[PDB]
């Protein structure tokens, strides 16, 4: 298991997923979300672009799955949520 889930549910995948999933997944919750679109959420949109950039590093994704978000955040670029 993984200790937190919410990235891989804001990309609508398992948390076992592989890169194609990851990609797949981002895409799809990409172009729900755009500010440009309908659907358009810029909170949700950042969020899905966090769990990309973590969930598609495997190293980061590493660290999230063993301690989670805010462990993952910890001591990031200044300019990261």
Same mark, same amino acid.
């Given at each position: 298991?993984?200790?937190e889930?919410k990235?891989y549910?804001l990309?609508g995948?398992?948390? !076992?997923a592989?890169?194609?999933?990851?990609?797949?997944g981002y895409?799809?919750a990409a172009?729900?979300?755009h500010?440009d679109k309908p659907?358009?959420?810029?909170?949700?949109?950042?969020?899905? !672009?966090? /769990?990309?950039?973590?969930?598609?590093?495997?190293?980061?994704?590493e660290?999230?799955?063993?301690?989670?978000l805010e /462990?993952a955040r910890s001591?990031?670029? !200044?300019?990261?949520?």
């Amino acid at each position: 298991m993984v200790k937190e889930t919410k990235l891989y549910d804001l990309l609508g995948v398992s948390p !076992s997923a592989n890169e194609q999933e990851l990609k797949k997944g981002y895409r799809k919750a990409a172009l729900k979300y755009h500010p440009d679109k309908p659907t358009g959420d810029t909170e949700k949109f950042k969020e899905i !672009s966090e /769990a990309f950039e973590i969930l598609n590093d495997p190293q980061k994704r590493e660290i999230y799955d063993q301690y989670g978000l805010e /462990a993952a955040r910890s001591g990031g670029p !200044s300019f990261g949520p």
